[PDB]
């Protein structure tokens, strides 16, 4: 499952240890320009809430997933997936 | 800090949810050909012990890491690096 508790633990590691991915997400899937920083406010089964510093200045964007997340691994799989595709284009 | 408890938790997750990689490591860093499948047995700070099925026979190899692992996060970062570098090998 994906509960707010499960969300925060994700956004703690993601922000602490995988920050360059959060930026690549805002850049490719968030349609931001010259992203200096991005952090995950929340992750739910339908999308994640990013706080991005990008062209025009700091903002909150919502990235919607193509499909709902059934479990937590779904979230692992999407964050590996989005990283790969976001690296493929640029 | 990697305790045989944390090795079992990483190895089980790797084994049930990311086997395509375990096989990539065994291929590229384990110098294995026609890798039917592979499994993570254990991960200690100096390397991982892997069960890689060659065609008609099972071998136990160890991938020593090119730099010691401090903690679990270092453990994630290398499983991530080695995946990236294994796919490049093409
Ligand atoms: C012990 C539990 C975990 C294991 C064994 C694990 C393993 C991996 C592996 C093997 C990859 C490479 C994927 C591939 O190339 O196919 C990966 C990527 C990733 N993982 Fe984990 N992971 C774990 C927990 C987490 C958690 C808790 C988060 C976030 C909250 C996370 C976030 C990511 C991200 C964002 C990627 C893509 C990173 C990139 O492109 O650099 N992982 N993980
Ligand atoms: Zn996973
Ligand atoms: Zn990590």
Numbering used by the authors:
A (entry chain A), B (entry chain B): 4 to 93
Please give me the paper's original passages concerning this structure:
Using a phylogenomics-based approach and complementary structural techniques, we identify a family of dimeric hemoproteins comprising a domain of unknown function DUF2470. The heme iron is axially coordinated by two zinc-bound histidine residues, forming a distinct two-fold symmetric zinc-histidine-iron-histidine-zinc site. Together with structure-guided in vitro and in vivo experiments, we further demonstrate the existence of a functional link between heme binding by Dri1 (Domain related to iron 1, formerly ssr1698) and post-translational regulation of succinate dehydrogenase in the cyanobacterium Synechocystis, suggesting an iron-dependent regulatory link between photosynthesis and respiration. Given the ubiquity of proteins containing homologous domains and connections to heme metabolism across eukaryotes and prokaryotes, we propose that DRI (Domain Related to Iron; formerly DUF2470) functions at the molecular level as a heme-dependent regulatory domain. We heterologously expressed and purified the recombinant protein encoded by the Synechocystis gene dri1 (formerly known as ssr1698) and tested the heme-binding ability of this small, soluble protein (96 amino acids, 10 kDa).
The heme-bound form is a homodimer consisting of two monomeric chains running in the same N-C direction. Although the homodimer maintains the same monomeric fold per chain, a two-fold-symmetric zinc-mirror site binds a single heme cofactor. The heme iron is axially ligated at the interface of the dimer by His79 (Nε2; 2.04–2.13 Å) from each monomer. His79 (Nδ1; 2.11–2.14 Å) is in turn bound to a zinc ion that is additionally ligated by His16, His21, and Glu76. The heme propionate groups form a salt bridge with an Arg90 side chain from each monomer. In turn, two zinc-bound histidine residues, one from each monomeric chain, coordinate to the iron center of a single heme cofactor. These zinc ions may help catalyze the formation of the imidazole-iron bonds by increasing the basicity of the histidine Nε2 atoms in a charge-relay fashion and/or play a structural role responsible for the precise positioning of heme between the two monomers. However, we report here a protein possessing a two-fold symmetric zinc-histidine-heme iron-histidine-zinc coordination center at the interface of a homodimer. SEC-SAXS shows that heme binding pushes the system primarily into the dimer state and no higher-order oligomers or unreacted monomers are present. Based on the structure of Dri1, we propose that heme binding leads to a Dri1 homodimer that can no longer bind to SdhB1.
